[PDB]
Structure formats: C-alpha cells, structure tokens
Amino acid sequence: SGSGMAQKTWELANNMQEAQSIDEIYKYDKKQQQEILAAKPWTKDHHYFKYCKISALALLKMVMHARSGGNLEVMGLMLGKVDGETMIIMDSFALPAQAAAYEYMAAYIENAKQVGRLENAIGWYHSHPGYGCWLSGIDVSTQMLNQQFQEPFVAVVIDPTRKVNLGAFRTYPKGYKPPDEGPSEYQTIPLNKIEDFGVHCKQYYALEVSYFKSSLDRK
Ligand SMILES: Cc1ccc(-c2[nH]c3ncccc3c2CCC(=O)N2CCOC[C@H]2c2nc3ccccc3[nH]2)c(-c2ccccc2)c1
Ligand SMILES: [Zn+2]
C-alpha cells in the first residue's frame, strides 16, 4: 500500500539530496581554495609545486589548438585549481585581446559553477611546433612576471608534431639559484634553438605531468 508513491518519494529524496551534496561540495571546494590562496605556501618554497594533473578534455582542446596552428605557435589560457603541491588543469580555451581573455575566463568559471565545479585561472599554454617542450627566453621572462602577478600560475608547452609531447613548468625567481643539476629526460631540439635553450634552462624546472578523466569530461 502506497508502495508506488513511496518509490517516487524515495527517487525525489535521492535527487534532492544529490543536488544539495553537489552544492555543499562546491562551497567546500571554494572555501578550501580561498584558504590555500591566502596561505600562498609557494611564495616561500621556490620548489613548492611538483605535480600537474591535466584533464583529457583540456589536453584534447590544447592538442587540437596546437595542431590547427601548423608551423605557427598558438596560445591559450587554462582553468583549474591548486591541491597541495599539485596544479590541476581542468579546462582550456584558445586565444584570441586582454579584455577578450578576461571575458572568456569569467564565462568559463560561471559555466563550470552551474554544474557545481569550482575552477579559476591556473596558467597559460603555448605550442613549440617541431622543437620540443621547454621555456624559451621570452617564455622564462613572461612566466617570471606571471609568478609575481598571476600567481598560482603554470606554463604548459605542447609540441603537436611528435608520443605525448607536453611539458608543465615553473620558473625560479630572479636572484634564486637551484641546487646541483637537472637535465631530466632527453629531448632532441634543433641546433638553431640549442643556445636559447641553454642560456635559460636553469631558470625553471619541470612538474611531474599526469592525466585524468573526470565524470563530466566523459563526453
Ligand atoms: C605573452 C607571450 C609570451 C611569449 C609568447 C611566445 N612564446 C614563444 N615560444 C617560442 C616561439 C615563439 C614564442 C612566442 C611569441 C609568438 C608570437 O608572437 N606569434 C606566434 C606566431 O604568430 C605570430 C605571433 C602572434 N602574436 C599574437 C598575438 C595574439 C594572437 C595571436 C598571435 N600570434 C607568446 C605567444 C605564444 C604563441 C602564440 C602567440 C603568443 C605570448
Ligand atoms: Zn615558447
């Protein structure tokens, strides 16, 4: 008796509680992010960030944008958040210009908020078509200014021509000297680029890149 109505009430309760849970998770993520941003542990430890988790969706969009440029470098902005020593990249958008970059950034955050996901500006990406993942002279100077003004901010470099050719980097501040050596993995770079590479290779380091697939990103 009233078994049918009970089942519909049960389904309604599950749906109403799921909606409340998503809202509480969003609000908890927001406060947590605001707290991490107030503490700024990265301003004291120059090697604080060590990991970079990239969604398949952000990767798909970045590779498509990088491929579309051909032999020309392209760039865009990335959305995500901080989780300890890990920089999370959840989404990205192609560029194109400053006001336009501001208005898209605001639109992507609102769109994610509607589906209960917290994200903000986390970095920039650009392509090195046919010459590997590293920071050039202009990239090192741009990323140093970013780690003073746009902080927390990561520099992603993609080489769409050749395996998973993506690098995530963090510069060292002016005057700071890191300890010992760090050539990491091998990368073949053209001879006409090797000097610019060498002149700036100790002014930054690489984050440990990993990839993830979100439930919302299963599209
Ligand atoms: C703030 C900043 C700092 C450094 C760079 C950058 N890092 C690099 N690493 C290797 C070789 C070069 C670079 C450039 C500069 C590359 C460029 O200047 N261009 C690309 C080819 O096309 C003409 C031109 C360009 N300038 C644009 C301005 C707005 C929109 C598209 C644009 N393309 C960029 C950048 C990167 C890619 C595309 C656009 C800007 C932006
Ligand atoms: Zn570059």
From Swiss-Prot:
Cofactor(s) it depends on: a divalent metal cation
Entry EC number(s): 3.4.-.-
One annotated GO biological process: regulation of cell cycle
Keyword entries, A-Z: Acetylation, Cytoplasm, Cytoplasmic vesicle, Hydrolase, Metal-binding, Metalloprotease, Nucleus, Protease, Signalosome, Synapse, Zinc
GO molecular function, one term: enzyme binding
UniProt subcellular location: Cytoplasm, Cytosol; Nucleus; Cytoplasm, Perinuclear region; Cytoplasmic vesicle, Secretory vesicle, Synaptic vesicle
A cellular-component GO term for this protein: chromatin
UniProt KW Protease keyword: yes
Domain MPN, chain residue ranges per copy: 52-175
Domain remark in the UniProt entry: The JAMM motif is essential for the protease activity of the CSN complex resulting in deneddylation of cullins. It constitutes the catalytic center of the complex.
Described purpose of this protein according to its UniProt entry: Probable protease subunit of the COP9 signalosome complex (CSN), a complex involved in various cellular and developmental processes. The CSN complex is an essential regulator of the ubiquitin (Ubl) conjugation pathway by mediating the deneddylation of the cullin subunits of the SCF-type E3 ligase complexes, leading to decrease the Ubl ligase activity of SCF-type complexes such as SCF, CSA or DDB2. The complex is also involved in phosphorylation of p53/TP53, c-jun/JUN, IkappaBalpha/NFKBIA, ITPK1 and IRF8, possibly via its association with CK2 and PKD kinases.
Miscellaneous comment text of the record: The CSN complex is associated with some 'Lys-63'-specific deubiquitination. Such activity is however not mediated by the core CSN complex but by the BRCC3/BRCC36 component of the BRISC complex.
Subunit record text: Component of the CSN complex, composed of COPS1/GPS1, COPS2, COPS3, COPS4, COPS5, COPS6, COPS7 (COPS7A or COPS7B), COPS8 and COPS9 isoform 1. In the complex, it probably interacts directly with COPS1, COPS2, COPS4, COPS6 and COPS7 (COPS7A or COPS7B) and COPS9 isoform 1. Interacts with COPS9 isoform 2. The CSN complex interacts with the BRISC complex. Also exists as monomeric form. Interacts with TP53, MIF, JUN, UCHL1, NCOA1, HIF1A, CDKN1B, BCL3, GFER, PGR, LHCGR, SMAD4, SMAD7, ID1, ID3, ITGB2 and TOP2A. Part of a complex consisting of RANBP9, Ran, DYRK1B and COPS5. Interacts with IFIT3.
This protein's name: COP9 signalosome complex subunit 5
Species of the source: Homo sapiens (Human)
Parent sequence residues shown: 4 to 236 of 334
